[PDB]
Amino acid sequence: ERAATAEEVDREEQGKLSFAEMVVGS
Amino acid sequence: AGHKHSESVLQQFYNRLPVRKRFLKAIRKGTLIWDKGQVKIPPIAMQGYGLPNKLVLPHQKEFNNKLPKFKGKINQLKATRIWFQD
Amino acid sequence: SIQAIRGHGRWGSEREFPRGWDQLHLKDILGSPLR
Amino acid sequence: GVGGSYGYDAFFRGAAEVLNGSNIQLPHLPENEEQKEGKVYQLHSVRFPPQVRRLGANYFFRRQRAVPLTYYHHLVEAQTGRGQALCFVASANPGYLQSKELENAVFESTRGFACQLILEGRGVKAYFDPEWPNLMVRLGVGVKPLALRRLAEQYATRAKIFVDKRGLLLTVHGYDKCAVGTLAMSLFNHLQANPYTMKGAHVAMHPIKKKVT
Amino acid sequence: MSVVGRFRLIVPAATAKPSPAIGQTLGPLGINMMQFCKEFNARTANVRPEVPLQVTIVPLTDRSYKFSIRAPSNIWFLLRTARCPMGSESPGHQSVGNVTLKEIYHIARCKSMDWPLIGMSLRGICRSLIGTARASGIEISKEILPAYHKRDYTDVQALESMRKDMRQRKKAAKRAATKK
Amino acid sequence: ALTLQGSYDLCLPSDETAKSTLALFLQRACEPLSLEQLENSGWVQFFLYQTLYCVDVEKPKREVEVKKAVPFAFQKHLHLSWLDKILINAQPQGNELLQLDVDAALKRLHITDALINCSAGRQWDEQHCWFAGHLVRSRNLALEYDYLLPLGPGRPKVSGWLACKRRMLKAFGLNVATIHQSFWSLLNLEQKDVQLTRLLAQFPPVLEAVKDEKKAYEEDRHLRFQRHARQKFETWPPEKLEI
Amino acid sequence: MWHRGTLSLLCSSCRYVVRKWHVPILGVDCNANPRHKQAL
Amino acid sequence: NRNPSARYPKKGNKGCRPVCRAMRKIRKRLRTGN
Amino acid sequence: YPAWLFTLDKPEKTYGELAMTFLYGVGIENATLDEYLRFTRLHTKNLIKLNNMRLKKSKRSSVKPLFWDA
Amino acid sequence: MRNAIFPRIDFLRYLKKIHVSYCPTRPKTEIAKQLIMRVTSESVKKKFPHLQASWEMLAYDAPATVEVELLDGRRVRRIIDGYSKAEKKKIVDDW
Amino acid sequence: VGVLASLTSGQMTTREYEEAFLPRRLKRIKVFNTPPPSELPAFFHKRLDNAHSNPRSILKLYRQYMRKDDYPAYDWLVRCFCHLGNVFGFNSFWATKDKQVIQALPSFKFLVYDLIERKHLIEARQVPRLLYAFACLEYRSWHLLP
Amino acid sequence: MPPFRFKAPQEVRIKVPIGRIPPAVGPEIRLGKSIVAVAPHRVTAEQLEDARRVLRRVLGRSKEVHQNVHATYAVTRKPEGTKMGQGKGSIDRFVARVPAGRILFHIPQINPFHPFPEVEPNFAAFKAIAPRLPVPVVFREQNNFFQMHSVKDLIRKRQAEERENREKTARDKLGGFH
Amino acid sequence: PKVYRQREGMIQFVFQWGIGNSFRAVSANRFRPVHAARPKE
Amino acid sequence: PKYDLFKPLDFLACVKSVHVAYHPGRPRSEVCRQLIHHMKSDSVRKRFPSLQASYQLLGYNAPSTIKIELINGKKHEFQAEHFSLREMQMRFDTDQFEAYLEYMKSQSVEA
Amino acid sequence: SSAVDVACKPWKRFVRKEDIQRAGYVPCIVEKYGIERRLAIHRDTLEALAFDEQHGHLSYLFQARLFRLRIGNWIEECIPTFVQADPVARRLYFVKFERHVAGKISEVDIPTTMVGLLACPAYQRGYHVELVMPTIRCQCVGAEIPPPFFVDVSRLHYSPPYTAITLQDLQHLLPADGSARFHPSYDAATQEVAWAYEVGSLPDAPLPADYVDPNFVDRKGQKMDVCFRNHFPN
RNA sequence: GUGUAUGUUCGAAUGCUACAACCACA
RNA sequence: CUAAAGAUAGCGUGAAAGCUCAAAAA
RNA sequence: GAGAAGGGAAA
RNA sequence: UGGUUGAACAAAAA
Ligand SMILES: [Zn+2]
C-alpha cells in the first residue's frame, strides 16, 4: 500500500487538533 | 326471536340489522362491524403505531396522537403484528 | 416554499452564487429604490 | 359502533397491547437514516422518449399530486442529444419520475412486454396442432394434451404465445402488461408442475420446490 | 464457461489412497481421484509424508478442475508447538497450554506462504495466531509461564495417539459418570 | 425585456454613431462573468440565449452587433447546455386552468392530434426555444392562452412572453389563435364547444394527423373468442382435454 | 391457509394483503413458506 | 347481558335508570378490577 | 527479532475506553492513530452485532449476553 | 459515520493540493489511473470542496508519481507504481 | 400508555363529569387575561414580520386585520401584498394554478379593493415593490396600474 | 449493606374482607427495566410464580429479576358441599392487591449502549408474560441518562458545523461575493 | 428583570394550628377538629 | 405468492461490447466513471461473462463518448456528457429488448 | 450546569388547579424565603424536563435541577420540592417549588449516572453491575447546584463475594470551593453507590423489621387492624 | 472477502446440532 | 475504483456447494 | 354523525 | 385497472 498510510500518519495531528477543538468548544 | 324466547341485547341488535345474512354472519364473527348505517372492515390495531383518535379516551387522545402514524397502504405496512381493535 | 424563501430555489442555492431574482438583491433594490 | 362507543379493550385497558411489543425478532430493521434532516430539495428533470406524449393532461396535469409535475414536449423533426423528439418531465419530487405508467406508455407503443414459462419432465412437451393458435401441451407419456386455443382467442391482437423448437419454452409476448401477465399466469396456473413428480411448467426464475414423501 | 463452486479438504502429504476422507468431496464432483492424488503427490514432493495440509478445489462446468495447497491449520501448528494434544474445553476460563511470542513469530513465518495471506503482514499473521490461541484456550507469554514450563516431555511425533487416548478416556469416564 | 417588446434597433438618440442599447446591455452583462460562473448564473443563461435566438429568428438590422456582443464561448456553452436544465427550469411549472379547460373542450370536440406544451421551430433549427399551449399539427395551428386581466372591460391583452411567442410562431410559419380568458370564462360548456368548432373551421385539416396508436398483432384480428361456448365431449375417452 | 384472529409478519418476505372472499378479508402472503399464508 | 338491568341509560336519563346494573358494574371494575 | 513483536502480548484498549476517548472526549489530546482505527473497527462491529441481535430469530446461543441488555 | 461524531478516516480530508503524473506506456499504472479517476470524481468534489486535484500524462518516460501539498504547507512526493487487481491476477496464476 | 390512573381509579374528577351538572350554555372561564392591543398597525406588522412563507398565513393575517378594522394601515396592506407576491417570486416550485387560485380567492379580491380605494396614498418608494408583486402573481391590475 | 437475597413475605392465613384496592400514593421509580400495572387488580400467587418462571427462562441464569409484589392477602371460597348463609368460606387462594402504577417485576441492569440511542429496549420477557397477567401493563426503562450527556446532540452540532463549512468553501471558490 | 429576594430580617416560622382569614373568622367555618394540628410554615 | 415478472433489463443485459472514452476532469463526466465501475463490477462479470468492456482516458479536453454494440449487431454511440445512464438505456431500449425477446424465444432465461 | 431558565404566566385570582390544567398548563407554587407566589407553566415545556427519558417516568434530575422561573418582572430561583404526577401516565398535576438562596442549606438529592458501563471489566466478564443509589443527598449552599455525579466503573473488577464503589470514591467530585457536601449522616467509607456481583450467589437475609406489607393498607394510609394480631406473620 | 473446516461435544459439526470464546487483516 | 465485511442475521445441504442480509460505496 | 341499539335513510 | 376471480392472480400507488 504505502503512500496513503504514511500521509494518514502525517495528518493524524490535524485530526486530533480538530477533535480537541470540537470537544473544547462544546 | 323465533324459538329463542329471550336473547341477549347484543344478539337482538345483530338480529335486527338490515343486511344480507352473510354480511351479518361476518359481523357476528367480528370480521366486519356495523357503524352509522354502514358495514365496514373494523379498525386495525398496529403494534407500535398510534390508533385512530376516535377509539381512545379523551384524556388519552393527546398521548395517542403523539405516537407514530401510518399513512400508507396495507401492502407497505411493516408492522410486526396487526389485529382488529376492540 | 420555505426553502425557496430562505434562498435555495429551483436554480440551486442563492447563497452559493446569484441565480437571478435573488432575495437579497431584490430586498436591497425594492427597499431603497431611490437615489 | 366505532366512533360513538368505546370498546372494552380501549376503555378498561387503554389499548396497552399496542405498545406491549418486545422489539426483538423483527422481520426488518426500522428506518433510522431519516434523521429529520430537512434536506435541500431540487427540481429534477428527465428526458423521456417522445412516446410519453401519449399520456396527456389527464395524467400529467389533472391528477391530484402533492407537488407540481411539469411536462413539456420537444418535437424537432449515433446520438448527440440535440435534434431528436423527446418529453421533458420535471418535478421537485423524484419519486414522480420513477412511475411505471410513464415507461408503460412508451413500451406499449414501441416493444411491449414478455414472460417465459419453462416445462420439465419426461413426456412433457408444448407444440402446435398444426399451427398457431392451436397450442397443445402434453404433461407426460400417458397424459392427453391440453388444448389452449381459447386463451389465444381471448388475447388475440394484443398477445401471442411462441413455442420453442424443443417444445419446452413458452414465451408470452404482448403490448399490454396487465393482459400479458394475466395470460401468462393462466397458462402457468394451468400447466403448473407437480412438486412430487416435477412434471410440468414453472415461471422463469420462480422454480417450484421439489417435495419428497 | 463458469465455476461450479469452491470446495475444501485436508489431505495427507504424499498420500494417494482414494479413501472416503477424499471421496466425501471428490466423489460427488466426479473428478478422477487417482489423477487428483497423482497431481497432489507431484506438488507435495518437498513436504514430509503423512502431513495433513489444506487443499482447495475449483471445478468448472467443462469438468476441468484446478486446486491449491497450503500449510496446516493455525491451531494445528499451535497445538504442535504447545505439545497439547487436546484443546481447551472452555476457552476464556480454562487454559491448557502456553506458547511464546517468538514461537508465534516463527509459526507466522511458516504460514506466510499461504495464498490468502501472501500480501498480508507478518504482524497481522501473528495477531491472527494470537486470536486463534485465545479462542482455543492456549496462553501466550514472552517467557514460559512456570505453570506450564516443565511439560516438554511429550513427543510432537506421537501426540496423535495421545489425542486418541484422551478421546477414549474422556468418553469412557463421562459415560460412566452419566450412568452413575 | 427589449427582446420581449422587439425593440432591437433601439439606441440613445444623442449620437448618430450610437451602439445598440441591447448590445451594450449584453456586453455589460457578460463582462464580469466567466464560464464557470456562467454555468451557475441561472436566469442569465436563459435571458442571453433567448436574446440571441430571437435576434437570429427575426433577423433585425443590428443582428450582427447583437451577436458580437456575447462571447462565442458563452454562446457555445449555452447552445450545448440548453437541453440539460436551462429551458426546463425556466419554463412555467405545473398546470394552467385555462389550458385544462381548452384541453377538455378539444377532447370533447374529438381533436386527437392536439399536443399540449408542444414546441415548434424553423426547419433547420436543432433546438426549439418556445412551447405553444396547444399545437394542432394537422391544421398548422397553435393555440395560446391569455389568463391575464384585460386592460379594461372587454379589452384583453397578452403578456410579453406570449407576444414574443406569437412573433416566433409567425416566423416559424404556424397560425396563432389566442384564447382570452376575460371572454372565455363568460361562456358555458355548449357555447365554448360551438366557438371552438367555429375557430377550427377557419383552419381546415391541411395535413394528415399522425397517430400514436398502441401496437397490436393485427394478423390475429380474425380470431374469435366465443365466451360462453360450452365444452364439447366429442369422444369417450377424450383424446384431447378441451380446456 | 392459516386462519387467525391476528396477523403477523413471520419472515422478511411476508406482506399484508386484502382478499376478496365472501367478504373483504385481511391476510398475509408469503413467497417463501406456504405455511406463512394467513387470513384474519 | 339481558335487557331489564343491562340496558344503558340514554341522553335525558343523566346516566341512571331505575333497575340498571351496567354503570355501577363498570365503575366497580374501573376502581378495583374484577 | 522485530521490535514490534515485543508489544503484541500487551492488551489493547477495549471499545468502552475508546468510546470514552472519542465519543465523550475523555483524554482526547493523547489519542493515537492506531487507537482511532481500532475504535472505527470496533464501532462498526458493535453496529453489526446490534443489527443482528434485533434481526435474530433462532435458538442459537451465538449472541453474547451483553447485547441482550440493549 | 453512524452513531459517531467524527468522520471515518479518509486520506484526502486534510490535503490542500494533489497532482498525479503518469505515463501510458509504462506498466503498473492502473493504480495511478484509478487515483486520477477518483480524485476527479464529483463525489470527492462534494466531500472535500477544498481539495484541488490535477493530473498529467507525461510525454517523457518516468514512473507514476503523486505529489501532495498538505493544508499545513508541507509537500511530499511518492512513487505509485503497483499492481492492484493485478495482484489477484498474479496470485490466481501462481495457484 | 396515557391511561391517567388518577382518573381511572376514582381519585380525581373529570371536566366532563363536572360539566354534566351545569347549564349547557355557561361561558368558559378565561384562564389568562392579557391586555388586548391598543394599536393594530404595530401588532399586525410584527405578525407579518413573522410570516413570510405561507400564503394561507398571509391571507389569514389580512382577514383578521379586516375583521378588526375597516381601514387597515395602507403601508401594512402594501407589505402584505408584497409578501404574498414574494411567496410566488420567480424561484419557487409553485404551479401557475396556485397563483390562479389565490387570485380567485375572495380575500385576495378584498385586499386588492382596499388597495384601490386608497390608491392615492401610494408613495413613490413602494412602486417597484408593487410592480414586482404584480409580475410574481401574474395579476395585472389595471385599476392601480395608471 | 452488602448485597442480599431477602426472604419473601409469608402468606397470612387470616380471613379478611374482600375490600377495595386503594390507589397508589405516587409513581414508583426503579432503574433498569420495569413492568408496571396500568389498572388495579389482584394478582394470584400462581400467576406471579408463572410470570417469574417465564422471566427467568427467557432472560437466562446470568441475569437477575426482582419480583416487586407478593401474594399475601387471603381470599376465601365456599366448598360445594355447604349451604348458603353458613358463614364465610374457607381460604381458597392468596393475592397481591396491585393498584395502577405498581411495578410487578423489574431487572436492575442498566442499558450499556448509551452511544446507540436508536436501539430501543428489549422487552422480550415482558412481552412473553404480559398477555397472561390479569392486569394491563406498560413496559418502562430508566437508566438515569440525561439529555445533558446526549451524544446525538454533539453529533448534530458537528454535522451542522460541517455543513456550514462546506457552504462557506463553495461560496469562496465560486467567488460571487466579497 | 430582577431576582426576587425577600425583605431583610425575615425568619421561617410555623403556625401549628393554621392560619385564618375572612372565611375562617366565622365560627361556623371552623377548622375541625378545633384541637387538631394543621402546621403551616 | 406474487411473482416478479417484467423485471427491467440491466444496462448490459444483451450488450456485446461497451467502450467508454473520456477525459477525467470534464465538468459533466460522472456517467462515464459510473459506467466504468458498473462494467468492471463483479456482478456484471458473473451475469455477462462474454461482455467485452473497455475504456480509454484522453489526455486532452475532448468530448466524452460511449459506444455500445448489441448481440444482434445494432450499434449505438452517445456523447455521454448530454445523457444519463437511464436516458441512454431508454434511447437504445428498443433494440436491446428485441434482442432479449429473440433470445428468450429459443433459450431459457434461467441459463 | 443543569440550571434551566423557564417562562411562566400568572395563576390568576379566581382560577383553579383544574382550570389551569385543562388550559394546557401545570399549576405551581413557589414558597419559602419569601411570599407564596402562584404561577402556571406550559405543560409540554415542564413535562419535557420532568420526563426527559423516552421510555422513563419522572426523572431524578427534576427534583435536583435549579429552575429559573420568570414571571412578569420577577425571577424565582428555586427547586421542585413537591410533585403530584400520574402513577402511570407521564402527566404533571401539581408542583411546589422551594426557593434556593446562596448561604442557606438546600437538601438536594443529586442523581448518579453510569454512562461508561461498556468499559467496566466486571460487566465484560458477564457479572451483574448495579447502580444501587439513584441519588445522593447533598447540602448545597452555593449559588449553583452540582450536576449529576458520574460514577466511573472502568476499574470495577469483580472479586467474591462482591465489589463496591462507595461514596468516598466519589468524594473527589464535589466542588473545590466547598459550596456542596454529602449529608453528614452518610458514612462515606461504607455507603455503596455501585455493586458488582454474581447472580445466584448472594447470602440470605430476613425481611427488614421496618417492612410494611402493602397488601394490608387501608384507603386512609393506615395499617389494617389485622396487622396487629398475634398471628400476623409479617 | 480472509486466519478458519477457531476450541470442546459429535461417526463428523466446514458461520448456520449444541456449548466456549467472539479475537484477528498497514 | 474507493471503503467495508457478524468466528454470522435469513435461507440452503445427510455433509459440502450456492443466494441474500448486516457494514461501506454510489 | 351520536345505544342513530324504534323505523326510514341523510353529510 | 382487468369477468382475472369458489381457499387463485396480473397492473398502478405510495
Ligand atoms: Zn414468510
Side-chain angles (χ1 to χ4, degrees), chain N:
Chain N
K2 172 196 242 234
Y3 287 158
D4 325 310
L5 320 159
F6 313 110
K7 277 213 170 322
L9 297 174
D10 175 67
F11 192 95
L12 309 159
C14 292
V15 174
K16 170 210 57 196
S17 74
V18 50
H19 178 245
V20 187
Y22 87 105
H23 167 79
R26 286 285 290 179
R28 332 208 271 101
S29 55
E30 194 43 47
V31 73
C32 295
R33 203 173 148 281
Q34 198 204 132
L35 184 51
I36 289 162
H37 293 344
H38 180 252
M39 63 169 180
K40 295 212 147 21
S41 36
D42 279 292
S43 266
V44 166
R45 318 225 207 191
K46 210 223 67 193
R47 277 145 47 171
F48 323 120
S50 266
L51 174 45
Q52 303 155 33
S54 66
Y55 86 86
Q56 285 189 354
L57 304 173
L58 314 179
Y60 45 108
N61 292 274
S64 325
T65 70
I66 167 178
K67 318 221 310 297
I68 293 119
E69 302 202 60
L70 294 174
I71 58 159
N72 69 4
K74 315 225 82 72
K75 276 138 159 163
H76 289 271
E77 175 164 353
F78 307 85
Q79 273 243 33
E81 259 150 50
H82 305 285
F83 305 79
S84 100
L85 273 205
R86 110 184 279 201
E87 287 172 340
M88 290 177 223
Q89 166 137 238
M90 290 169 333
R91 212 84 53 231
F92 68 79
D93 189 279
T94 325
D95 305 318
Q96 176 188 237
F97 190 87
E98 268 140 50
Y100 178 63
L101 176 64
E102 162 143 13
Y103 173 92
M104 171 178 355
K105 280 165 164 173
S106 44
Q107 342 285 342
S108 175
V109 170
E110 288 188 359

Side-chain angles (χ1 to χ4, degrees), chain G residues 8-15 28-38:
Chain G
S8 61
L9 304 177
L10 297 164
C11 76
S12 190
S13 67
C14 291
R15 73 200 228 288
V28 173
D29 190 28
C30 185
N31 282 337
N33 201 330
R35 305 197 182 194
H36 285 190
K37 294 192 296 184
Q38 305 150 84

Side-chain angles (χ1 to χ4, degrees), chain I residues 41 44-45 48-49 51-52 55-58 60 62:
Chain I
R41 173 71 165 122
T44 314
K45 274 209 189 187
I48 297 162
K49 308 247 203 134
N51 277 349
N52 302 15
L55 293 179
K56 163 98 154 81
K57 328 266 287 194
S58 59
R60 294 171 53 193
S62 54

Side-chain angles (χ1 to χ4, degrees), chain F residues 43 92-97 147-153 156-159, chain K residues 90-98 100-101 103 138-143:
Chain F
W43 280 104
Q93 310 294 322
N95 188 204
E96 288 96 341
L97 291 174
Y147 54 62
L148 287 194
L149 277 184
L151 308 179
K157 185 182 177 189
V158 303
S159 44
Chain K
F90 283 118
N91 273 335
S92 33
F93 313 65
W94 301 105
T96 314
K97 180 195 167 188
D98 308 319
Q100 316 284 15
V101 170
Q103 289 175 12
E138 288 180 277
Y139 177 90
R140 186 180 67 210
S141 193
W142 65 268
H143 306 91

Side-chain angles (χ1 to χ4, degrees), chain E residues 7 22-36 57 59 63-65:
Chain E
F7 291 73
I22 321 285
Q24 275 190 336
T25 162
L26 278 292
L29 259 56
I31 305 305
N32 190 313
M33 65 308 311
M34 281 147 135
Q35 162 56 101
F36 150 69
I57 316 302
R63 277 201 314 290
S64 183
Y65 73 93

Side-chain angles (χ1 to χ4, degrees), chain O residues 136-218:
Chain O
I136 291 151
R137 169 70 71 67
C138 299
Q139 298 182 335
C140 317
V141 291
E144 293 148 29
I145 305 270
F149 289 122
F150 168 52
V151 184
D152 189 27
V153 291
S154 58
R155 298 153 172 41
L156 167 57
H157 301 253
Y158 167 74
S159 35
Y162 82 87
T163 304
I165 295 172
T166 56
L167 258 191
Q168 36 171 33
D169 305 357
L170 289 65
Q171 158 64 32
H172 75 280
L173 296 170
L174 288 163
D177 58 359
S179 34
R181 68 172 183 176
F182 296 124
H183 196 252
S185 87
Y186 276 140
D187 180 5
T190 206
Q191 192 62 32
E192 301 158 331
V193 183
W195 291 342
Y197 74 87
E198 148 155 287
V199 174
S201 59
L202 300 187
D204 293 1
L207 59 96
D210 81 344
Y211 180 71
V212 174
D213 195 324
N215 286 353
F216 295 83
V217 180
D218 72 357

Side-chain angles (χ1 to χ4, degrees), chain K residues 117-134:
Chain K
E117 170 171 49
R118 294 176 280 168
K119 62 176 196 180
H120 67 288
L121 292 191
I122 284 179
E123 316 140 23
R125 81 153 218 290
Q126 292 147 82
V127 198
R129 221 185 322 273
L130 291 172
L131 289 176
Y132 163 84
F134 286 163

Side-chain angles (χ1 to χ4, degrees), chain E residues 38-60:
Chain E
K38 189 57 145 299
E39 268 181 47
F40 173 89
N41 305 288
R43 291 170 176 274
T44 57
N46 165 38
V47 86
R48 280 71 61 191
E50 304 294 340
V51 166
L53 40 59
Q54 296 171 147
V55 176
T56 53
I57 316 302
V58 179
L60 280 141

